[PDB]
Structure formats: C-alpha cells, structure tokens
Amino acid sequence: KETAAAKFERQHMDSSTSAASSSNYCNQMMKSRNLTKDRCKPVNTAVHESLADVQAVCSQKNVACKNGQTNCYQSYSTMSITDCRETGSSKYPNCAYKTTQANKHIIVACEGNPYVPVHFDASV
Structure with a gap:
C-alpha cells in the first residue's frame, strides 16, 4: 500500500515539466501518473515547483481545510x-x-x- 506522502507526490508533483500549459499536458500527465488506469480521475492539480518548496508549505500559513480540519x-x-x-x-x-x-x-x-503534504486542498 502506497503511503499518504508518496501518493501526494505521485498525484500532485511535477517539478520538471516544460509543457505545463500545453493543451495535451494533462492527458499525458494523468496517464503517466496512473490516474486513468481503472477510471478517469475527474480533477487533479499538478504543482511545478521543487519537492522541497512544496514540502516547505507545511511550515507556512496555517489555514482551515475545506472539510473543517485544521492541518492545512x-x-x-x-x-x-x-x-x-x-x-x-x-x-x-x-x-x-x-x-x-x-x-x-x-x-x-x-x-x-516528517510533517509532509498528504492532500491537495485547493489553490488561490
């Protein structure tokens, strides 16, 4: 079973892409990260920053999550x-x-x- 941290990396991390805006980017990314194997994942956000920069967010502004939890x-x-x-x-x-x-x-x-990302709540 994939750990929560590893699942977040697979689903939401794409630091190296040079085609983040290409019309076909998502079709390729969703397939490669295995998000279309048994069914099509409806929505998914990929972050184009280093893993270190995304992990660092866990020590930044604490805000409420959409579901009410306070670990966002x-x-x-x-x-x-x-x-x-x-x-x-x-x-x-x-x-x-x-x-x-x-x-x-x-x-x-x-x-x-370590205290790391396990869920992508939203972007602003």
Missing part, C-alpha cells in the same frame, strides 16, 4: 500549477482532459513525522 497550510508565494479536469468528450477508457495552467498559492493538508 497555504503557501506564502504563488507557485506554477496546472489544473487537469475531464472534458465533456472524456469517457473511460478514453479519458480526455482540459489543461489550465496558473500561478497562485497552494493549500495542502499535512501530517506525520
């Missing part, structure tokens, strides 16, 4: 991210995604020792 943190700086969401023509096993790149703050839920 908002990055002080804006980060390059890409939102991947299924389009209308998307239909497993033929998943299709719209790619929307943006530069804003990320909010992640953190836990454990």
Whole structure:
C-alpha cells in the first residue's frame, strides 16, 4: 500500500515539466501518473515547483481545510500549477482532459513525522 506522502507526490508533483500549459499536458500527465488506469480521475492539480518548496508549505500559513480540519497550510508565494479536469468528450477508457495552467498559492493538508503534504486542498 502506497503511503499518504508518496501518493501526494505521485498525484500532485511535477517539478520538471516544460509543457505545463500545453493543451495535451494533462492527458499525458494523468496517464503517466496512473490516474486513468481503472477510471478517469475527474480533477487533479499538478504543482511545478521543487519537492522541497512544496514540502516547505507545511511550515507556512496555517489555514482551515475545506472539510473543517485544521492541518492545512497555504503557501506564502504563488507557485506554477496546472489544473487537469475531464472534458465533456472524456469517457473511460478514453479519458480526455482540459489543461489550465496558473500561478497562485497552494493549500495542502499535512501530517506525520516528517510533517509532509498528504492532500491537495485547493489553490488561490
């Protein structure tokens, strides 16, 4: 079983991509990170910053999570991210995604020792 921290890395970390805004970025990313194997994950955000920078957010601004928990943190700086969401023509096993790149703050839920990201709550 994949650890929570490892799952967050696989689903939300893409530090090296040079095509964060390419229309086909999401189709490729979602497939490669195994988010379209048994079904199409409807929504997923990829962060284009170093793992160290994203992990550092767990020590930044403490804010409430959408679900009410208090273990969420908002990055002080804006980060390059890409939102991947299924389009209308998307239909497993033929998943299709719209790619929307943006530069804003990320909010992640953190836990454990080391205290690291385990959930991507939202971006602002």
